[PDB]
Design a protein around this nucleic acid. Sequence first.
RNA 1: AAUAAAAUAUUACUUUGGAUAGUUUAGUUUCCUGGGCGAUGAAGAACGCAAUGAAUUGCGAUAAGUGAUAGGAACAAUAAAAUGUGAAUAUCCAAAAUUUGAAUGCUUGAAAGUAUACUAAGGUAUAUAUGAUAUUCAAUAUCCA
RNA 2: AAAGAAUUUAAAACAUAUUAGAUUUAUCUGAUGUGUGAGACCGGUGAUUUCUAGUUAAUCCUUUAAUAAUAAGGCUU
RNA 3: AAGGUUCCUAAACAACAUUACUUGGAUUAGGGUGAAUCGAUCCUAAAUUACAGAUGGAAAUCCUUAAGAAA
RNA 4: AAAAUGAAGACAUUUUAACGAGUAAGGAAACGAAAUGGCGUAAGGACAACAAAAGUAGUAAAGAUUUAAAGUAAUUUAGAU
RNA 5: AUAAACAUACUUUGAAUCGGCCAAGUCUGGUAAGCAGGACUGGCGAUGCGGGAUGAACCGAACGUCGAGAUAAAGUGCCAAA
RNA 6: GAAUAGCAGGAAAGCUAUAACAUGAAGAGAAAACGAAAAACUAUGAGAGUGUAGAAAUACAUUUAGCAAUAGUAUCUUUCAA
RNA 7: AGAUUUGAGUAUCGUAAGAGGACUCCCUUAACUUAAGCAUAUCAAUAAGGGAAGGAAGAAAAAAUAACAAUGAUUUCUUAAGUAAUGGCGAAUGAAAAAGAAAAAGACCAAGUUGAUAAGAGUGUAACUAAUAGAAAAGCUAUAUUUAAAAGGGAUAAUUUAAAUUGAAUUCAGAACGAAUAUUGAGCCAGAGAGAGUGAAAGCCUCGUCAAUUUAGAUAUAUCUUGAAAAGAAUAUGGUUUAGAAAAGAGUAAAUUUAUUUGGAAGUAUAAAUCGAAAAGGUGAUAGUAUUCAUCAAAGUCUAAAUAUUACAGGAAAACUGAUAGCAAAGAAGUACUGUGAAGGAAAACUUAAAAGAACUUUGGAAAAAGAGUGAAAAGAGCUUGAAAGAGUAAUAUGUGAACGGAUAAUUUAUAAGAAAAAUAGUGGAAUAUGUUAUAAAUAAAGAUGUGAAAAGAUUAGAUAUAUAAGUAGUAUAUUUAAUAAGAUUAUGUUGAAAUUUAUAA
Lengths: 265, 210, 270, 148
Amino acid sequence: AVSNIHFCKDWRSKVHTWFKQPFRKIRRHQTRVEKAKAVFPATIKSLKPSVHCMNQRFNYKLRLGRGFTLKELRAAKIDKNLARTIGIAVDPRRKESSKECLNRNAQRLTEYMNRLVVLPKVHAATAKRLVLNKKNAEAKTKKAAEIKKFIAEHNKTIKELKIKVAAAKKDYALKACLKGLKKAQVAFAAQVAKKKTKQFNKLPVQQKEAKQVLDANKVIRLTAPCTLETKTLTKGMKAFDAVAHLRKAKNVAKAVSGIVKGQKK
Amino acid sequence: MKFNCKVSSNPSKARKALYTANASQRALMMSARLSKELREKYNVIAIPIHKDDEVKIIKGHQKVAGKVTAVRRSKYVINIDKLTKTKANGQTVPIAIRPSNVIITKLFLNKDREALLAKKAESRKSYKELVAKRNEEVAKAFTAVYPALNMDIFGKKVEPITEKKPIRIPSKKMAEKLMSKPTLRAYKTGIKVHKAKNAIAAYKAALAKK
Amino acid sequence: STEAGKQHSAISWGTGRAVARIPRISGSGSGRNGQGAFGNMTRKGHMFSPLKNFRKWQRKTPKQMRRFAVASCIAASAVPALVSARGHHIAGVPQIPLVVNSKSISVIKKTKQAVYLLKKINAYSDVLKVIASKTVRAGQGKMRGRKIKERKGPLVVYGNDDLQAVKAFRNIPGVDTCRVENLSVLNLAPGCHMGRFIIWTESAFKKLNTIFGTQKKMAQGKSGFRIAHAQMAVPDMKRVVVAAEKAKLLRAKIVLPKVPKRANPLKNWA
Amino acid sequence: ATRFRQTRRRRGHVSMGYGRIGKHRKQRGGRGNAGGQHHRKTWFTTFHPDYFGKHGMRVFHLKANKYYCPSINVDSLWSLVGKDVQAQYKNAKVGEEVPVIDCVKHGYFKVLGKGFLPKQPVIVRARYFSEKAQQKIKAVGGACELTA
RNA sequence: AAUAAAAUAUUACUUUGGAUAGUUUAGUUUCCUGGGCGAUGAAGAACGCAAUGAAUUGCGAUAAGUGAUAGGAACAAUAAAAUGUGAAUAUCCAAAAUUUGAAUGCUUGAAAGUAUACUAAGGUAUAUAUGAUAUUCAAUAUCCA
RNA sequence: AAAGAAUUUAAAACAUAUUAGAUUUAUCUGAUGUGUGAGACCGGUGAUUUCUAGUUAAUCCUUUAAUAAUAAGGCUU
RNA sequence: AAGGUUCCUAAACAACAUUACUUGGAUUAGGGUGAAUCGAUCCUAAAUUACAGAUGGAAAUCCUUAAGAAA
RNA sequence: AAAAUGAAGACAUUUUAACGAGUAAGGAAACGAAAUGGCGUAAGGACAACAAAAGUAGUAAAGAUUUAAAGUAAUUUAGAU
RNA sequence: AUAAACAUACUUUGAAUCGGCCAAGUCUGGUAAGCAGGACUGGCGAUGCGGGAUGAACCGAACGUCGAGAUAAAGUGCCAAA
RNA sequence: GAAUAGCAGGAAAGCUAUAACAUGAAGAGAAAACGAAAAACUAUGAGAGUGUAGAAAUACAUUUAGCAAUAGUAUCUUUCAA
RNA sequence: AGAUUUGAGUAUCGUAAGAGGACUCCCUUAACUUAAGCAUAUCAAUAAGGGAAGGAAGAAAAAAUAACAAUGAUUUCUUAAGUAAUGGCGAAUGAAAAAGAAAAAGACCAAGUUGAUAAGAGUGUAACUAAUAGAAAAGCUAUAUUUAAAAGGGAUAAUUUAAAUUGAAUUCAGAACGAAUAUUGAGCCAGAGAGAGUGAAAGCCUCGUCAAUUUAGAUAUAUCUUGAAAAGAAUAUGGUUUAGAAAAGAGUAAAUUUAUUUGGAAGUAUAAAUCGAAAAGGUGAUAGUAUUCAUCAAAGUCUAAAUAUUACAGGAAAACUGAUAGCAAAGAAGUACUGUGAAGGAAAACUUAAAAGAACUUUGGAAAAAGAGUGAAAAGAGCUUGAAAGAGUAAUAUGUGAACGGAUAAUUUAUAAGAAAAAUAGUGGAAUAUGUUAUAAAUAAAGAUGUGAAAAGAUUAGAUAUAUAAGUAGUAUAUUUAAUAAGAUUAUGUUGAAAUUUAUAA
């Protein structure tokens, strides 16, 4: 074998030895521990989005990003100025990639907001937010009744149908129920289209026992666990020709050159 | 084992710190034990030696008693008036004695040994109450699991377990085939030696029975 | 030192001076001048290829083969022939896989009680052999701090719930403790001789099946590791021999006939 | 293990196993791949007959991620789910549920046709397909699905 | 042919030499914590200071040491004196800190030196560049009575 | 001519139409509609691919966001 | 000029001066060098070095009264 | 080399037969019938009086000088000073 | 016909080496050479032993440590066994 | 023992980490563009029985099996070209 | 005469310089060497020379990647990768996106707007100012949302740093030694058996070590107080009346040429000569023009954290060296000594436990010697041991132009092998053999197949409490209710192998 060794330069002064490696572990760990002691959710490693990877080689894998876009904060009803102070990373540089990216990261913030508990800015029980939350309590209870009751009327058909399909799959392990739920889902979506909500939700501020968690990205999992997928083999899938569809796609793109040459002649 | 990272277990660094110790720390190294009579009066085990302190030699050629005439912290030795040697021409010179080979019998206590002997006394008492407090908690835990027993069983004779239950494991057949040749020949030699020792004892017992 | 022995401006004197061609120190006024230089055969020069701090000190071993050897080292601790052959006095022990109650361990807080437990289970024969035969090192290793050379005694393997009884056993001479999960050949086969006398506690012994699994189940605490089967099922040659003798397949044993010496028929009438 | 080297078996022999006529000198024909066409030409000719020259076109900044395409043959498809799942749906046909063997999730982008498939229906979903791979899947009674 | 002076051979003992063996207050390497100098004069150099010192060590005309805070009976080669009314010893402290040196009033070779001002001697200040403020000026440079 | 449901609720680019405030300039700056750009079919429609016979075009590979004419690089001799 | 106590005295001779030494430019210990007029200090000669200026990527080089509200 | 025997003897098993010069060079470790066998220097981890005091040592270590013995040899062992 | 099972066929990895010299019922250049260069074989190199007094190559014969016996080349007046 | 993150023990040692990637499972072409079965065939070959006999071992006849390896083939992927 | 501009002198208050440069940022066109020669290339941001800093420095918030189901400041590590590319296409040189981690943080100038404009600047301070990226001023409003009197003092707690204090158990007994820690016997401590010293080997003699205590120092650590808990203030999306009808870095980007550099190849980066933009524009690495697409928006500034370190200082460790070794240096070592100078640069460890370092006599000019004495022992200061080379003394042997070695014998000397015992006949069983009984030990099972229990959980559906609520079985936590599916682990049935070999006593 023809050897290829780049040792003709001075490699002896280029040698880096890792004798400090066992001591880097102790040093970094002691700082991670000291950070939580100082202010515990500072090492909480502020929540980050679920962005896809680049290139076709990786695009089917999700991975943590850096900061939510300002459109994802508005969708989740969070002030961008308050987001950085409750352990949420913000990246105004990122442009929104898709509707599906906007939706997926919108539930990531909503799930985080429900789990989040914010202590008052002043410990003393006479803090304004503690006082205000007691003053408007009767209005919130009155408001809660309307929200609960008019939620309980809009989902009457969907909730009842969703029970039927759940039991239909149980007994089967069906076609009639699936058609019924699909037809109802279209109507509900079409009813919503035919409309002004809160600009910002409330910050959940309360007094509670301090249960300290070292991060939030390990609590809200990026992706749901995968299982075996099975499908109903129909006559339509049996006759679909994937090879013909790939060669048509390849040849159509390669035919855009001849189209341009033909016109110019 | 030592667990303090600041101190060192290096013999070379231990000796060097001993030879370069200043006069302040050389006095604490020169300590001798109090005698039985002085130990009962003050409840102090050992104090640094002093001039005019009477001592008795306990290790060496001559176990004489005398008065300390010189404490030499550079040489780490002391001098006794009784122990002397004539320097050939007739004059006598003192003989150095390590302070750890003598015990103090009479004290020279002006005003500060009263401060020291009192301070070293409260320290002994305060540690005894600390050991006593810890020893009662160990006893408190032991009885909580073995109520019928007492903590005094540890300081007495132990009776071993006489049961000899064997276990059948399908590896005793290979035990001689998992031995290297050097260690198999030693194992089998010890077996043959023990049998000969056991055969003679059997033969001796027959004659004793006869 | 990377500059040891090479700290001179020495050059060779050439030929024509009736002296060898080794480089020589420059100048005058001292005895050092005109002497040898860097060469490894010379005095105060650099040695042969000087030792470099970026050598390969630590070695790499596959994890599965690391676990293969630990199981073989644990399995060998239950063979009294191998445990004794390693140099352990285990004549008085009740069972060779010595397991003690977890309730008894939980009350151990002093070295006087830890010694009491060792005497009861007849393990003090090993503890005393190390005490009685402790000696001093033989060679230059005493200058470096290694003076006392002791022997190996029992190994105490405990579990997660026996973390308070460790401080009692650690001061006993020649008694090394370990945790069941942190086992390795450095404890089980010290000196590369297998069959350490291991004293198990109840919790550690009852965890061994979870950690290692069996020959039919994959280990839970060791992902990807399963105990291997020996090259033979029953490592004994006798049962096959008696089967063929029963089946009349073996010829009879042969004693080589005495080969007669050559004689001279022209003179030896017999 | 320096005690197992050959230097320990040659202590006493003058030349240390290198010959008396042809000594062990500094160089044996140059430093590196010197003389690739002059005095080591018979070496490069013998053992690397296409070492010298040029071939093919230059790619100024190659994108090796664009040529990434793991492939799996048809005979290795059912291993992606297991032999226990395969036996469960052994007696299925058109109309009822059939397992979907997606390959992108397992990291295979293209499916090739080599070897044989078990005589069961299956739904193979992947990015690219081969002409003989799709024949073998359809002949067994299955379907081909595209992705991305 | 002959003798053993010389010559040669072995052992014991002595001698010249300092190998070998035992030993280490010395090094080497890695890692941890810092990485804390100077016009308020540094690093470096010179000279001087111990009852008896040449080097070395410590120190600076208050000299192998002063005050203060801890510390508790020494030092020693030989004398002396002082000493529980506090000896050795230690210090991120206080006082003091010769000639030089970036060396900076001017000159400096191995050069001894020297001017002005302020407060006979003694002590401070006065180099170059430079920011801000005050002040005295120069230029018909722009206007302008 | 013969085989084909096609997957499922949080949206910005603005080509535009219409007004509002200003400017004269190679003139702009806000906001309100619409389509675009949309995708949830009921045994049968059919988007979609295939086959045949013509006809128009393009055809050795590459310059890596897409094409084009020059240019350059490939492969064989 | 260079050397640096080699000068003088006393005690003393182990080493050193190709024999020896009571001798010594050698060992030990003390003593010794006095300036208004002799010199350095003062002046300039060949030459040499500063502030500002000029040059140079840089270290630094040039200029010595020419370039300066300088001397 | 071939037969025989084989958990441990022991001398690296028993028997029979053939063979044995040698420069450069090769024969790394392990491999029960062992895919050559060994001696020596130093250091590290274990073993070294099996009944609870477990290798030798001020009743004399290491080293040195010699006298003898074992080994084909490398070397080892013991006595005396 | 004869011989051949520790036969036969190898495979992989690699060392050293390619200054050679001698003899002859052989040859070419040369007056010739212990000169220069070749064909076939055997040697020396790498090799000691018995003989040629002595000798790298000649003659006999190739070597574990030995005891006894016939032998090889060649010898049998003394050195020197016969 | 990829960095790295944890565990007990205080530990440059030990243990645990559904993990990026490295080599391999597929090969040809410069590249675009592709991407492997007639569920193979032939020859010789390893092993297993049964019977007879000499007669001690062992030799002959017959039934079956066709691994490794070598060679030759049909077929299939890629290339202007196998 | 006055108002300014510019430039000086002086006074006051400060600032730079020099040391160090291991790590950090840069300037400069070395060569030996490799290519088996050598001239481009390589050595090589390498050596030397030069400048500047800090405890770290540098970089840092896209005129960036990519062509995707897309990302998103900087730095460092893994991988990509000895790959794409570069190269007398020779020798050789050689990246980066993606992907996995450590750490995470963003802010200001200028330009624009507001002008009864603000001791110093009006040739402009100050205030507002960007991804819904035509901002910017004054005043009324609406809706969601954030909010305790900030900062600064004082006290306790907690976490770390330093110092001090404390810190068990034989001052045991016998024998022997110059001397006990060693040896024998009997004990004790241990969260302490790391280590040093001690006439000699010590867990229990001293100092220490494990476990602790106290006092001080810091935290941007929490509590209480000063401190009231109000008035208000703040983010964002809108409406309205006036004001206003903007700006976004120039000898810069780019171009022609040259030179160096780069993996960057019809030019990756820097610089010089010339040239030089904009109703913007850069990039998508094959030069060119055109039309689309994508993604950014240069020519100003700062910015912690993760990373480096062979200066130097203080510590800890070691399969490191053990006085020709390890630093050149284990002693007054960069010392002695050499050179005009830059510079060059060594050697030398050990008496004893303790100097008890002989001390007085005789001979001698003296040094010394002989006695005497100390010491366990002269170990006698040229001092632990004391090898070889070379000598001296004593014993023995040998001899004509070398000496030494080997085989074989002779002589001399030395080493060095033993205390049992015969034949025949009475007496004797004493080691042992055969095989019968009794007892003891050892030797056989690898597996296959039935039935259960089950923690931690998971999924589904209700209830309660708190928070939030978007109009998509509302979500999240906690306590519970009932069920399904699996479950690490774990318990126990059935089956299926003895009859032999040794040992002891008759």
